[PDB]
Amino acid sequence: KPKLLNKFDKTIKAELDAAEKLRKRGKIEEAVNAFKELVRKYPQSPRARYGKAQCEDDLAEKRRSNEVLRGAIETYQEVASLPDVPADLLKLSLKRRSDRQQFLGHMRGSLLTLQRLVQLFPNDTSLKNDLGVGYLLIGDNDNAKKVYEEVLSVTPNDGFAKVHYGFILKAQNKIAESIPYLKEGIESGDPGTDDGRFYFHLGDAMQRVGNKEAYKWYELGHKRGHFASVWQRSLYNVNGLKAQPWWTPKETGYTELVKSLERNWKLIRDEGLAVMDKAKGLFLPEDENLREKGDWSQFTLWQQGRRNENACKGAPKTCTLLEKFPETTGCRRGQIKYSIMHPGTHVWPHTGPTNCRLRMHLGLVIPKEGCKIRCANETKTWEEGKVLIFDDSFEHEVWQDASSFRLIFIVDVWHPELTPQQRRSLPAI
């Protein structure tokens, strides 16, 4: 289907075919030298150049080297610099460049590549879509929205553009506006629309607007292998881990940590209260759109397994206490933080991003009534000096209708059934 040979390359199709054959046979070692020879002989051949790039790519796989892949990334661009490059070959070479640049984390660089691709092929919708993703991976939702808007003006039926437009809208708290786009987009069945993210956010948006069809999409999302279950909808998961909403200290194995938190809960409280009084700026409002209403702020000591030095100067003994416990201070997919919630607060039902952590709550200041937390189908309350443990990858919801503030201490731990190796390798969240 794809024509990759220009006028000149057709006159050397034999040599080019010869070289490619070696690559396909896995003999990626001598296939390089073969294309390197053709490149030397025909320094303007796009197909010879693309051949070199592809072998360098495979070599990066075999060797698992970033420098050789970095080299392939440049060779892929080299192809685009040559004269008389066929469109199909031009598109292929630059697409793969972007792909691998995103693999290496050169998202900024992958963007310029995608912008170039859209400039070179202004009629290709799928490239505009990929450009949109490029913007989303750098947190540039504004430019991503423009792109998908640009796409839908020309192609209102593109499901990919719809889910992504819906995703951006919901992230903008345009809840009602987002639903038709997420729904129609998934239903379109286009490639790239069967993503757990869109199932996750469609249902949440539905829940927020009182649409009882929400769990119909959680159910479908589960049936298509995105959610471990209808209640547990985290997307960054290690499959197999014991999954249950509520845990007991003994069940986690982290009994020393719990003892330490409960035995020393008052110094933990006092340092938190002291920050409230003399440094309330260290408490930052919740900024993930998880609130329907009310005041909710958090004072973070650890995140992604990294100690916040300045924060710990506000809770020095607490931080000194926790340094003893690497199961939490080394949890690169959790946090350690004070969490204060005031009356008139309701937190939407929600789920955390990963099943790789369990979440501990130490009661510090708990009003006699008004404060409760539901995880799955069971609601519980906090007690001062007592630890609650739940898996926040399960849907959970929170209320604060007391007559004064409620302070807790949140301590995340690695899921106990995670092997030491897993705890070392898992990318941070």
């Binding site: 993703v133 989303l136 993210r197 996750f200 991003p353 990318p427």
Partner: peptide
């Protein structure tokens, strides 16, 4: 942005 309590970002890692 980071995904601390939820899944708001297009990618969390």
């Amino acid at each position: 942005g980071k995904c601390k309590d939820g899944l708001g970002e297009y990618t969390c890692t």
